[PDB]
């Protein structure tokens, strides 16, 4: 049964999201407090980095989970994620610094919260906005709780920041969400309109100019309405770009779900679930997956199929992917909250293709709660997106893992184990199954039109945050639902633990790299008997090599990374040796120890 899916999945999916959060998480131990790795996976594929969009969203689901119940770990947490924004808002990286703005726009960084100098998909112009959403959103918590004063000093000149870079940035191409296509990108623009209408509530709360962001704010909306395609019905995804596709990708439906307002209804303007055009688009998305994968074969016309991220995708093959799947399931739970909520369901031409998939023949028209039409919709609606829960349930492994993808003939899962994204998707889509909604960030204001669209920016000032600390037992107000901090599920405690030696070295012709260390695993300083690393991942300006042995759990170890050329040549990296402690904590079993090769 889907009930008994959420039931078991639910604790497995919070927890394995919680062990990808640092510093203390139990797959990214050691990494930067605040950090969220969006993949443990070190090797087909290296996710072990630090996305601003991944972690930003990831923080918005826990920042909500937070808002429902005060839970003092994830505080904990949240504090840390934001923290470590002053550390990566500083760094000039390969997309620049933050004296003009154009160092915010960096997609991801190493987890040592460093610089990510490889050849990369950048910029990335929707990380600013999610981050804007996330820190707004503990923003609103800390405002309605008496702790304005530490937003002002610590908080607000973070988000500043990433508002500034939104309204001056915003109309210039970069990289969409799967960092592989130059140009305007729907998620990117509504994201970023949705940042500048927050940003502009939160600017005036502080008694701040919100000014120009809410001059700005329309004008991204304009640009919104161009993506639109009305001979198809359905939004192109990219535009001010020809990618060599049709444009229908989960880059919208997650777009739909991401910037979901009940309070704004069934507006067409900002994409809502229910809004007709969001629901053409669906249909037209999903449509795209139902005849090419392996997994969907069989399953006939208003029955939910695996969904991936675009049908031309070739990334490990083109496959359904998880969080693909679940956004597809959480739009139409979306859609039944308000239509539930309205006790009123709309057809409109636009969506008439989206209904009588599901009600064939239905006309278009407005059905109030008591007729019998919206009874036929509404169950049919809700049979189909519990149809999507079970249809990516049916590829959730025994132990309920969730990797990225799960393979389009199989349904076996691939690419990154246990991706964090994945998690929240779960997360989110069943807390919108539940009728557990976000805080609302619009008013009908945010979803005014204007006549014509200028292309407005603001050119925006940058500084450097100070202040890397919160206060205290920064606690609820009295009255507010409260709980026990958050706890991981429990493990065993390991006698041994994989450790990923994972260095960054650049090597010549033939040249492999070893761990040459003190324990017996590591062969005791004989250069012959060093443990040899992976030159998979070596790239322009990112030369990376990983290599894990098992080391004793409490084991003190000393290690030196040795160059050993083709000919059995060893050079060694200067001194000093290096010393790690092999941790020994409860559920932690594998580490990466992450280091640079010292000349
Ligand atoms: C910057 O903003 C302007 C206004 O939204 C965009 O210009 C429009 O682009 C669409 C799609 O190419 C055209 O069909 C319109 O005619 C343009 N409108 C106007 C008034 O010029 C432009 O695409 C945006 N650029 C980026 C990179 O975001
Ligand atoms: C955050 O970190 C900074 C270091 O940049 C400190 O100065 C501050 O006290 C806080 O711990
Ligand atoms: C790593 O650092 C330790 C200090 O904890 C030294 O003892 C060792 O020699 C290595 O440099
Ligand atoms: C790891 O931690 C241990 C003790 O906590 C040290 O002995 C070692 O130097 C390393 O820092
Ligand atoms: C070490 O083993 C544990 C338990 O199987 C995993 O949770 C972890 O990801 C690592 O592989
Ligand atoms: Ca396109």
Redesign the pocket.
Known sequence: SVDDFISTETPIALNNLLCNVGPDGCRAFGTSAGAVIASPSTIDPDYYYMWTRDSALVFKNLIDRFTETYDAGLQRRIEQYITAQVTLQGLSNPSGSLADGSGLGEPKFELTLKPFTGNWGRPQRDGPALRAIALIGYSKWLINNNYQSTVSNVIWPIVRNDLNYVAQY????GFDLWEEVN??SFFT?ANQHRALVEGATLAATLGQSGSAYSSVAP?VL??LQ?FWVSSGGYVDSN??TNEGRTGKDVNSVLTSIHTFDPNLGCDAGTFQPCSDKALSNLKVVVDSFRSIYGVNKGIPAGAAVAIGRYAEDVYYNGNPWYLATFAAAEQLYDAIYVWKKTGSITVTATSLAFFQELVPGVTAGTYSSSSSTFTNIINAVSTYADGFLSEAAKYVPADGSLAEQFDRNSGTPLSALHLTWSYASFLTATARRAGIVPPSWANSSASTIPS????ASVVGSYSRPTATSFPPSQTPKPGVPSGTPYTPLPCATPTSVAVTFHELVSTQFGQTVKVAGNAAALGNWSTSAAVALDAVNYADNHPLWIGTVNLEAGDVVEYKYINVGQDGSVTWESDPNHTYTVPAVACVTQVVKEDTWQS
């Open positions: 915003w109309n210039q191409t140009g305007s623009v004008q304009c640009f161009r535009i001010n014509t669209c200028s292309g």
